[PDB]
Amino acid sequence: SEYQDGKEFGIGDLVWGKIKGFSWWPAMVVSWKATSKRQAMSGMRWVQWFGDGKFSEVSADKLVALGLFSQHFNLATFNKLVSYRKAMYHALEKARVRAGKTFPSSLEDQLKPMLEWAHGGFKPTGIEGLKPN
């Protein structure tokens, strides 16, 4: 099937993705049929970037689980770029619903506890709660 090349990551997976000129960026792995483009080359994945909803063909060697959060969260980029803060919001929101996590009740202010939850290791489910389906 699609993405049956031995490498990691399948459809639905929340990932960090690395492309030239950008900090690690949160994304969702999608099927090529969602992209309106073409099938990924072997060992690549199509991902859709949180925050801007664009698609990129990214090597699987340039992706890591979003659950490895503190290891790829870029604090400098976060402070610098409103777009990265929005990406974080939409990415963590998707994570929060998957994990069955809920927070008490702006943007900065809504991000704050999802960001702590993420940086803290996604307790109580851990990364296990970030899986799709």
Q: Rule CB under 8 A: is residue 100 a binding residue for a second copy?
A: no
For residue 64, list its beta bridge partners: 16
- Binding string to a second copy for residues 24 to 63, with x set by CB under 8 A, is what? ----x-xxxxx-x-xxxxx-----x-xxxxx----x----
Identity of the residue, 59 or 125, whose beta carbon is nearer to a second copy in the bound complex: 59
The DSSP-derived string for 14-61 is EEEE--TTS--EEEEEE-GGGTTS-PPPTTEEEEEETTT--EEEEEGG
Select 37 or 75, whichever has its Cβ closest to a second copy. 37
Tell me which amino acid residue 25 is.
W
Q: Using CB distances below 5 to 8 A depending on partner kind, what does residue 90 bind out of a second copy, ligand 9AH, none? A: a second copy
CA-CA distance, 133 to 131, in Å (whole number)? Answer: 7
Rounded Cα gap, residues 23 and 113, in angstroms:
22
**Contact residues for a second copy (CB under 8 A)?**
1-2, 4-6, 12, 20-21, 28, 30-34, 36, 38-42, 48, 50-54, 59, 90, 94, 97, 105
